[PDB]
Amino acid sequence: SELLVNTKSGKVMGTRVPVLSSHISAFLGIPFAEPPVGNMRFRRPEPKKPWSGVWNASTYPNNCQQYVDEQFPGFSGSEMWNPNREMSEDCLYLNIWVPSPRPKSTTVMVWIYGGGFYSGSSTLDVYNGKYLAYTEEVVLVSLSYRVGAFGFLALHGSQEAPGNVGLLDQRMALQWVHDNIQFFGGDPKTVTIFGESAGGASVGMHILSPGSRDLFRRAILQSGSPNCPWASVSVAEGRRRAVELGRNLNCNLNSDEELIHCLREKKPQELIDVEWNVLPFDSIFRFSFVPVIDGEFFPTSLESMLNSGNFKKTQILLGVNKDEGSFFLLYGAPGFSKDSESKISREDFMSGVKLSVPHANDLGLDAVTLQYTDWMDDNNGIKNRDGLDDIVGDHNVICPLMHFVNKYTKFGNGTYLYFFNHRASNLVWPEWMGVIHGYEIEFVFGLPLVKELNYTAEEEALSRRIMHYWATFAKTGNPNEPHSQESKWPLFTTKEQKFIDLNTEPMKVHQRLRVQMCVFWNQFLPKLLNAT
């Protein structure tokens, strides 16, 4: 039986799923760790104990416990990111889509969801692996990992809540893929990890962490990089926020043991309800429980690792969307709303700048304002709105990614950079938001191939082009088909810094992505802040 697979953990039975007038096999909700429940809350994951009989892998698993977005009830633009299954702390499962007939030793791609480390689900419609697995003939895996305090509460020095456990959940799923994917017809020596936003940061973190490097071959990072300002905190800051969470829940704070015990007694929703209260600043694009620079998962600072070439040397493919900032401004900044053009007054610009760079002193804020204000036309509401989008996008996504790409490329074995700038014809969000954080994912996963979803012909073609770049890259370390006539995606090099756009128009090659602003964010501002 094509739907029966024996693994080192036991037998699993999958399900035949229709896809684009054909079918493939899906193995959904396979456990890769023991349920991290009770006294196991906050602890490193434990390998799943093997089972007897046949694991029923016909249905999606529970999602991890998380904050749920209720800002626009019933609206598909926001609800498409929310858990679509029951939430449980029992949530460490993976999903595999397998071509039919079962392959022998094919390329494997492992998806790591984003959600700012506070949310996310492997089960979202937009992460349905069937289209990519079917079209490009890969074994497509999606893993899961604990988010929020359950994944990232960090009391450094404690073994009960050491931090980074969600990253260790991801590593354990990669370990399981390494050990077992061959039985599904996957080649464990040709595994590509790929992820978006926090999943992109996570991919970079596995590139860096000595304990993860050997578990995959190559990597794709979408709108995320390990050095993003929101993606990690120090052990002191992690400790502070954990104690502040305890304070919110009226915990005994006299020791780590007392705090952890109190926190373990709470219902999951109790933690989630006060999660946002522990942030040190009035901010946007900052999240409470995130990876911690611990000296173990990350042996030294991210900057010193990148500078010294202390990371996995392989090929990477990565890039960003045109309007990375707009999502967070909409949700978090005055003057921005879903149902208006959100033209921004000078005053709301200033408020926005302060929220966007919460760690800056007044001089730093002046620097940012000067860098992004057109002083020939400073009361232009469109320019102010677009300026803020750029500030938030450049600071949180594009410039950290550019800093990563330039550091990585000095030691790596091949870099391909993209700029995704296609606004989908059927987008439900307002026009002012442009090409939003997260909205390339639907193209990467082939949703535009589905008739009922109402994409244009050109959008289907774009999706096929992207799926083929991603999968060819996963296969070979190069997104370009050898000896094809199509226009080539050039290698990013330190010298020429080339990248391509990704849209429905003929591909163009560009150079030096947002270089002017990234010198400001990567070189000048940090120096200014360190001096003053």
Ligand X SMILES: *[P@](C)(=O)O[C@H](C)C(C)(C)C
Ligand Y SMILES: *[C@@H]1O[C@H](CO)[C@@H](O[C@@H]2O[C@H](CO)[C@@H](O)[C@H](O)[C@H]2NC(C)=O)[C@H](O)[C@H]1NC(C)=O
Ligand Z SMILES: *[C@@H]1O[C@H](CO[C@@H]2O[C@@H](C)[C@@H](O)[C@@H](O)[C@@H]2O)[C@@H](O)[C@H](O)[C@H]1NC(C)=O
Sites of contact with ligand Y (CB under 6 A) = 413-414
Least distance between ligand X and beta carbon 416 (Å): 21
- From 224, 263, 42, select the one nearest 116 (Cα to Cα): 224
Pick one of ligand Z, a second copy, ligand Y, none as the site partner of residue 56 (Cβ within 5 to 8 A by kind).
ligand Z
Nearest CB to ligand Z, comparing residues 3 and 515? 3
Stretch that binds ligand Z, among 55-63, 166-174, 385-393, 494-502 (CB under 6 A): 55-63
Nearest CB to ligand X, comparing residues 30 and 388? 388
How far apart (Å, rounded) are the C-alpha atoms in residues 170 and 191?
14
Q: Site for ligand X (CB under 6 A): how many residues?
A: 10
Pick one of Cl ion, ligand Z, ligand X, none as the site partner of residue 318 (Cβ within 5 to 8 A by kind).
none
Least distance between a second copy and beta carbon 420 (Å): 21
Pick one of ligand Z, ligand X, Cl ion, none as the site partner of residue 195 (Cβ within 5 to 8 A by kind).
none
Q: Which of 20, 23, 44, 58 binds ligand Z (CB under 6 A)?
A: 58
How far apart (Å, rounded) are the C-alpha atoms in residues 293 and 236?
10
Q: How far apart are the first and last CA of the chain?
A: 68
Least distance between ligand Z and beta carbon 89 (Å): 17
Q: According to the binding rule CB under 5 A, does residue 434 interact with Cl ion?
A: yes
Q: According to the binding rule CB under 8 A, does residue 495 interact with a second copy?
A: no
Residue 217 CA, chain-centre distance (Å), reads: 19
How far apart (Å, rounded) are the C-alpha atoms in residues 324 and 506?
23
Q: Residue 105 — φ and ψ, nearest 5°?
A: -155, 70
Pick one of ligand X, a second copy, ligand Z, none as the site partner of residue 59 (Cβ within 5 to 8 A by kind).
ligand Z
246 with 223: CB under 8 angstroms? no
Dihedral, CA of residue 354, residue 360, residue 363 and residue 364, to nearest 10: -90
Pick one of a second copy, ligand Z, ligand X, none as the site partner of residue 385 (Cβ within 5 to 8 A by kind).
none
Q: According to the binding rule CB under 6 A, does residue 438 interact with ligand X?
A: yes
131 with 446: CB under 8 angstroms? yes
How far apart (Å, rounded) are the C-alpha atoms in residues 292 and 243?
15
Nearest CB to ligand X, comparing residues 198 and 405? 198
**Which residues 6+ apart lie within 8 Å of 360 measured at CB?**
367, 368, 525, 529
Pick one of ligand Y, ligand X, ligand Z, none as the site partner of residue 361 (Cβ within 5 to 8 A by kind).
none
Q: According to the binding rule CB under 6 A, does residue 56 interact with ligand Z?
A: yes
Q: According to the binding rule CB under 8 A, does residue 346 interact with a second copy?
A: no
One character per residue 105-124, x = contact with ligand X (rule: CB under 6 A): ---------xxx--------
Pick one of ligand X, ligand Y, a second copy, none as the site partner of residue 282 (Cβ within 5 to 8 A by kind).
none
Helix (H, G, I), strand (E, B) or coil at 29: strand
Q: According to the binding rule CB under 8 A, does residue 494 interact with a second copy?
A: no
Q: According to the binding rule CB under 6 A, does residue 32 interact with ligand X?
A: no
User: Per-residue DSSP letters for 463-515?
Assistant: HHHHHHHHHHHHHHS-SSPTT-SSPP-PPB-TTT-EEEEESSSPP-EEESTTH
Nearest CB to ligand Z, comparing residues 28 and 306? 28
Q: Which residues are catalytic?
A: 197, 324, 437
352 with 360: CB under 8 angstroms? no
- From 275, 285, 427, 338, select the one nearest 72 (Cα to Cα): 338
How far apart (Å, rounded) are the C-alpha atoms in residues 197 and 202?
8
Nearest CB to a second copy, comparing residues 349 and 432? 349
List the chain gaps (C–N > 2.5 A) by preceding residue. Answer: none
Residues 513-532 that bind a second copy (CB under 8 A): 515-516, 519-520, 523-524, 527-528, 531-532
How far apart (Å, rounded) are the C-alpha atoms in residues 520 and 517?
5
Nearest CB to ligand X, comparing residues 324 and 459? 324
Least distance between ligand Z and beta carbon 64 (Å): 18
Q: Which of 6, 22, 39, 59 binds ligand Z (CB under 6 A)?
A: 59
- Largest Cα–Cα distance in the chain? 73
Least distance between a second copy and beta carbon 381 (Å): 19
How far apart (Å, rounded) are the C-alpha atoms in residues 155 and 222?
30
Nearest CB to a second copy, comparing residues 220 and 357? 357
287 with 118: CB under 8 angstroms? yes
507 with 418: CB under 8 angstroms? no
Per CB under 8 A, residues contacting a second copy are: 363, 366-367, 370, 374-376, 511-512, 515-516, 519-520, 523-524, 527-528, 531-532
Per CB under 6 A, residues contacting ligand X are: 81, 114-116, 196-198, 327, 437-438
